[PDB]
Design a protein around this ligand. Structure first.
Ligand SMILES: [Mg+2]
Ligand SMILES: [Mg+2]
Ligand SMILES: [Mg+2]
Ligand SMILES: [Mg+2]
Ligand SMILES: [Mg+2]
Ligand SMILES: [Mg+2]
Ligand SMILES: [Mg+2]
Ligand SMILES: [Mg+2]
Ligand SMILES: [Mg+2]
Ligand SMILES: [Mg+2]
Ligand SMILES: [Mg+2]
Ligand SMILES: [Mg+2]
Ligand SMILES: [Mg+2]
Ligand SMILES: [Mg+2]
Ligand SMILES: [Mg+2]
Ligand SMILES: [Mg+2]
Ligand SMILES: [Mg+2]
Ligand SMILES: [Mg+2]
Ligand SMILES: [Mg+2]
Ligand SMILES: [Mg+2]
Ligand SMILES: [Mg+2]
Ligand SMILES: [Mg+2]
Ligand SMILES: [Mg+2]
Ligand SMILES: [Mg+2]
Ligand SMILES: [Mg+2]
Ligand SMILES: [Mg+2]
Ligand SMILES: [Mg+2]
Ligand SMILES: [Mg+2]
Ligand SMILES: [Mg+2]
Ligand SMILES: [Mg+2]
Ligand SMILES: [Mg+2]
Ligand SMILES: [Mg+2]
Ligand SMILES: [Mg+2]
Ligand SMILES: [Mg+2]
Ligand SMILES: [Mg+2]
Ligand SMILES: [Mg+2]
Ligand SMILES: [Mg+2]
Ligand SMILES: [Mg+2]
Ligand SMILES: [Mg+2]
Ligand SMILES: [Mg+2]
Ligand SMILES: [Mg+2]
Ligand SMILES: [Mg+2]
Ligand SMILES: [Mg+2]
Ligand SMILES: [Mg+2]
Ligand SMILES: [Mg+2]
Ligand SMILES: [Mg+2]
Ligand SMILES: [Mg+2]
Ligand SMILES: [Mg+2]
Ligand SMILES: [Mg+2]
Ligand SMILES: [Mg+2]
Ligand SMILES: [Mg+2]
Ligand SMILES: [Mg+2]
Ligand SMILES: [Mg+2]
Ligand SMILES: [Mg+2]
Ligand SMILES: [Mg+2]
Ligand SMILES: [Mg+2]
Ligand SMILES: [Mg+2]
Ligand SMILES: [Mg+2]
Ligand SMILES: [Mg+2]
Ligand SMILES: [Mg+2]
Ligand SMILES: [Mg+2]
Ligand SMILES: [Mg+2]
Ligand SMILES: [Mg+2]
Ligand SMILES: [Mg+2]
Ligand SMILES: [Mg+2]
Ligand SMILES: [Mg+2]
Ligand SMILES: [Mg+2]
Ligand SMILES: [Mg+2]
Ligand SMILES: [Mg+2]
Ligand SMILES: [Mg+2]
Ligand SMILES: [Mg+2]
Ligand SMILES: [Mg+2]
Ligand SMILES: [Mg+2]
Ligand SMILES: [Mg+2]
Lengths: 386, 109, 63, 183
RNA sequence: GUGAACAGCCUCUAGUUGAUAGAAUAAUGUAGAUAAGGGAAGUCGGCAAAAUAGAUCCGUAACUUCGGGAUAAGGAUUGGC
RNA sequence: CGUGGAGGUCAGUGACGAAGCCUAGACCGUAAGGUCGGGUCGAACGGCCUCUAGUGCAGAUCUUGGUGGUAGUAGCAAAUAUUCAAAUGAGAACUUUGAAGACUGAAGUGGGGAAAGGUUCCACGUCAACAGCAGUUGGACGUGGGUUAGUCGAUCCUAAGA
RNA sequence: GAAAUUGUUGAAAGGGAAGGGCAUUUGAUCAGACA
């Protein structure tokens, strides 16, 4: 007949199917366009989401009612200890698209990565890469010709890096391994860089700067089997209705005599891959640095770790990326942080932030104190104590 | 081999019982304890002193105390030979407060 | 073994409802043999079946 | 006797029946075939584990709308169950067969289960009361179980025909001349 | 016992402790609850739900067959010692 | 062409296996059908000329019986609730006993009766069926025992009415 | 001791039904006729 009243559909067909993702580690489906003039470096980084806190900073936005006034803003923190380079891989262009033609690997390999190549470490003979390692023995011969080959062909080059998950409060021991495209100039310069960094170790500050807009690729929190009303934000049906009301009344006209792909239906929700853009780096923390969570204006020595520690995560003892606002995935998830695919002018991007104060009170309750020192100050002396 | 030990343990019933539907708390406790024995003694066969049973139900179905101070005794089995030679007897110890004790070994004679 | 009949009998002999007769588990073979009221009567006399006390409903907080 | 089709040396076999048994015909079908052909000893350990929910029985025909379980991976299968009453009856006959083999003087070490067949015994009708004053069949669907063990034996040797070759005049001319010419 | 009470709630005597069971706690349900700010805009329609409530005192309109309307409406109060 | 029965006949077939049933074996017929082999079986049966009719099925929401897919599926979710140990037993979530936790809360889940049932009472034995899990338990199954009146009822009287 | 319908064994085939017609390959199986 015809709707009767018009309303936009419910939800975005550009995110179908709404199924569980094939992996916890969302995939980088694209890297920044290559400018071969710049020096070589990575174009992404691995980390784990620690949690969020609050920030206070002045705003620099000539025109806004809040120009030159303080604003308070939520930020997330991801734990970001140095990634370690263990291999290079060269791709070539084919009329069927890009294909991988070799992967070269570093001679020694941390148990952390070695562990990734397994489903039952404790029983296993740990034989992984133990013949490959031998390829170094003879002068170097075999490894060079591969490297050599890469250079001759290879339209792009990605580095094999993995995380130092042991430097992290997580239990999960099994490190994370992944390809990072390498944009600094010249294929041949690229693999030299790669070869050079084998078993060596790369840092965030060598990849990200303050105020830079980055993207976050991650697998969304999971919620399991989900009714139509919350999965799609369909309207609740009236209270009077037989056999349930978190439903959709009309699942389709009579013709096409087929339920159609375009209507809301109960099913899985969450654990989707998402590529989220334009998150701004408000802080690049440094692990070896008390007063991590101190400020030009704060001074008072303290790290970004909340009293009692990041709820459900731990402690942060490594460099970190502070990004304003919120981000796909949940606490403890592996997250890839990526270089933006365009140079935003925006004004909003470009603004050169500088924090005044980073909240540090407990997230496990209605926290009242930044530091034990503060709490001790205000409370006075207790029956425990001295 | 075997071993035959008696130790005295404190079990945290509270988090094991956290959430459990009221009419199943004292029952989950029984079971949850049994589980606690096999975890420590390795022993499938777990028996509960009627006294311990009383200590559990001492406050009604949903009023199970937050901590119990058990005494678990791994013992050898007898008669018509069950699958395993070993079993465990659990009993209540008569402690003032069950709060504050780590796990000790009971010297055997 | 099956001491229902002796339980009921116990109740009736003693003048008390079954919710208060006590048959001790340790003299279970002897009790079973007790098929009669004269037998239960002896069993009651020598403490293989005891009356079990009333349950207090004290008037003390009422008072 | 007169069991189902067998193909097996009865001099080296032993057998057992159960008839009119009150177990689910469908479930014990499924469990009978888990066992079918196994080393007798492997099978008895195996049902024991089933009972312990440590291995499972793969449900392969009588199985629509059945649970899924990791314990069917072993057998290439997602639907699998642990049908206790069946098992206990089936190992009941397995036990019996063993005894019979012992009595025959058959080598226990070589015993594989060579025939195991269940089919359908007479149904047993109870009845149930449906809404609006109606009645409905409520039926036990019981089983006959029958099995046969055998001593495994190696080899088979050879022996067959000899293939009577037939070839025309021009056909044994090539041949004749093949050796007259070459080797 | 509380209380106006053979009410509800808890107890003594007596009698039961029968009602397939285990493990989990997805969607959707059935039954039981709560929800900021707004307050019937929902809907055929306040359907459902919420609000009210005992007692003591004060106070009480239209109209009427003078019997009523009336617990009208509207208020305050209430433990322990 | 084929069936049941009848007259004639072939001195027809047959316990050295009639009839029947089974058989991607054989052969005759355009076809209805006919013939054979092998297996199974166990007491009867057929060819030809005639006679005769309760004589040929896929259907009739056909009749009666039997059987499936559905499917190990819907389900077995009201009445607050169960637990430890022992005993017994091939076997115990469910029986017995002890302990504990609760319930009915005298408008009872107590103690008795009327109508109705008719042995369900009680003991002993006891699990094939039945008690929509179970079962060693039962209002089940087997075998026994048990209902005592001058005063309690009936019996007498009258009621509507017959 | 038929049939529906079932278990086992053996052989085959199976990309959203199956079964059928003319024809031949391939496998299996078989009658007759030769003298
Ligand atoms: Mg329109
Ligand atoms: Mg997958
Ligand atoms: Mg190569
Ligand atoms: Mg919900
Ligand atoms: Mg919405
Ligand atoms: Mg939302
Ligand atoms: Mg309705
Ligand atoms: Mg809707
Ligand atoms: Mg909860
Ligand atoms: Mg039979
Ligand atoms: Mg089926
Ligand atoms: Mg089927
Ligand atoms: Mg279902
Ligand atoms: Mg299905
Ligand atoms: Mg299912
Ligand atoms: Mg599991
Ligand atoms: Mg499957
Ligand atoms: Mg019903
Ligand atoms: Mg009826
Ligand atoms: Mg030649
Ligand atoms: Mg009663
Ligand atoms: Mg019921
Ligand atoms: Mg249940
Ligand atoms: Mg959970
Ligand atoms: Mg509201
Ligand atoms: Mg208002
Ligand atoms: Mg309106
Ligand atoms: Mg209004
Ligand atoms: Mg409207
Ligand atoms: Mg209206
Ligand atoms: Mg209207
Ligand atoms: Mg209403
Ligand atoms: Mg309110
Ligand atoms: Mg009124
Ligand atoms: Mg009025
Ligand atoms: Mg006062
Ligand atoms: Mg004719
Ligand atoms: Mg005729
Ligand atoms: Mg006739
Ligand atoms: Mg056929
Ligand atoms: Mg022929
Ligand atoms: Mg023959
Ligand atoms: Mg014959
Ligand atoms: Mg005969
Ligand atoms: Mg004629
Ligand atoms: Mg006719
Ligand atoms: Mg026809
Ligand atoms: Mg027909
Ligand atoms: Mg017709
Ligand atoms: Mg018909
Ligand atoms: Mg029928
Ligand atoms: Mg079944
Ligand atoms: Mg079901
Ligand atoms: Mg229901
Ligand atoms: Mg109940
Ligand atoms: Mg029970
Ligand atoms: Mg009991
Ligand atoms: Mg009560
Ligand atoms: Mg009452
Ligand atoms: Mg009752
Ligand atoms: Mg009576
Ligand atoms: Mg009766
Ligand atoms: Mg009798
Ligand atoms: Mg009786
Ligand atoms: Mg039975
Ligand atoms: Mg009955
Ligand atoms: Mg039953
Ligand atoms: Mg039974
Ligand atoms: Mg009887
Ligand atoms: Mg009299
Ligand atoms: Mg008289
Ligand atoms: Mg017969
Ligand atoms: Mg074939
Ligand atoms: Mg053909």
């Amino acid at each position: 007949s015809h709707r009767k009243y018009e309303a936009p559909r419910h939800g975005h067909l550009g995110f179908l199917p709404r199924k569980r993702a094939a992996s916890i580690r969302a995939r980088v489906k694209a890297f920044p366009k290559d400018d071969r003039s710049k020096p070589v470096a990575l174009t992404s980084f691995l980390g784990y989401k620690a949690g969020m806190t609050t920030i206070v900073r002045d705003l620099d936005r000539p025109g806004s009612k809040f120009h030159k006034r303080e604003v308070v803003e939520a930020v997330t923190v991801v734990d970001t200890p140095p990634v370690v380079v263990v291999g290079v891989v060269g791709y070539v262009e084919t009329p069927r698209g890009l294909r991988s033609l070799t992967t070269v690997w570093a001679e020694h390999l941390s148990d952390e990565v070695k562990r990734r190549f397994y489903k039952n470490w404790y029983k296993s003979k740990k034989k992984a890469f133990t013949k490959y390692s031998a390829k170094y023995a003879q002068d170097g011969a075999g490894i060079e010709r591969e490297l050599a080959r890469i250079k001759k062909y290879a339209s792009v080059v990605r580095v094999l890096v993995h995380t130092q998950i042991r430097k992290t409060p997580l239990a999960q021991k099994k490190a994370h391994l992944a390809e990072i495209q390498l944009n600094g100039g010249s294929i041949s310069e690229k693999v030299d860089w790669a070869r050079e960094h084998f078993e060596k170790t790369v840092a965030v500050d060598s990849v990200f700067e303050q105020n830079e807009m980055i993207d976050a690729i991650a697998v969304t929190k999971g919620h399991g089997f989900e009714g139509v009303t919350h999965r799609w934000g369909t309207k609740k049906l009236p209270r009077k209705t037989h056999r349930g009301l978190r439903k959709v009344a009309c699942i389709g006209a009579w013709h096409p005599a087929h339920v159609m792909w375009s209507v809301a239906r109960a099913g899985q929700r969450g654990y989707h891959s998402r590529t989220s853009i334009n998150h701004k780096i408000y802080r690049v923390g440094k692990g070896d640095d008390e007063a991590n969570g101190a400020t030009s204006f704060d001074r008072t020595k303290k790290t970004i770790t909340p009293m009692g520690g990041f709820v459900h995560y731990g402690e942060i003892k490594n460099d970190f990326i502070m990004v304003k606002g919120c981000i796909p995935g949940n606490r403890k998830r592996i997250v890839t942080l990526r270089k933006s695919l365009y140079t935003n002018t925006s004004r909003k991007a470009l603004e050169e932030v500088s924090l005044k104060w980073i909240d540090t009170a407990s997230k496990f309750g209605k926290g009242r104190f930044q530091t034990p020192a503060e709490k001790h100050a205000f409370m006075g002396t207790l029956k425990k104590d001295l | 081999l075997k071993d035959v030990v008696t130790r005295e343990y404190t079990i945290n019933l509270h988090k094991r019982l956290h959430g459990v539907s009221f009419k199943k708390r004292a029952p989950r406790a029984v079971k949850e304890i049994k589980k606690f024995a096999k975890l420590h003694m390795g022993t499938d066969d777990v028996r509960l002193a009627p006294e311990l049973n009383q200590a559990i139900w001492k406050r009604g179905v949903k009023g199970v105390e937050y901590r119990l101070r058990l005494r678990i005794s791994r013992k050898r089995n007898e008669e018509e030979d069950a699958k395993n030679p070993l079993f465990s007897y659990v009993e209540p110890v008569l402690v003032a407060s069950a709060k504050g004790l780590q796990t000790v070994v009971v010297e055997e004679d | 073994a099956n001491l229902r009949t002796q339980k009921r009998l116990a109740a009736s002999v003693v003048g008390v409802g079954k919710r208060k007769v006590w048959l001790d588990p340790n003299e279970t073979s002897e009790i079973a043999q007790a098929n009669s009221r004269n037998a239960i009567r002896k069993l009651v006399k020598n403490g293989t079946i005891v009356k079990k006390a009333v349950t207090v409903h004290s008037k003390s907080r009422t008072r | 006797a007169r069991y189902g089709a067998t193909s097996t040396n009865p001099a080296k076999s032993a057998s057992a029946r159960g008839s009119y048994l009150r177990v689910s015909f469908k479930n014990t079908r499924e469990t009978a075939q888990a066992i079918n052909g196994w080393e007798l000893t492997k099978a008895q350990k195996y049902l024991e584990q089933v009972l312990d929910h440590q291995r499972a029985i793969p449900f392969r025909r009588f199985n629509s709308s059945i649970g899924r379980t990791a314990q069917g991976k072993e057998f290439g299968v997602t639907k699998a169950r642990w049908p206790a009453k069946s098992v206990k009856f089936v190992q009941g006959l397995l036990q019996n067969a063993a005894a019979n083999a012992e009595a025959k003087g058959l080598d226990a070490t070589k015993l594989y289960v060579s025939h195991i067949q269940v089919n359908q015994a007479p149904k047993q009708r109870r009845r149930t009361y449906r809404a609006h004053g109606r009645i409905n069949k409520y039926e036990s669907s019981p089983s006959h179980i029958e099995l046969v063990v055998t001593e495994k034996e190696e080899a088979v040797a050879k022996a067959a025909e000899k293939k009577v070759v037939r070839l025309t005049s021009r056909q044994r001319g090539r041949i004749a001349a093949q050796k007259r010419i070459a080797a």
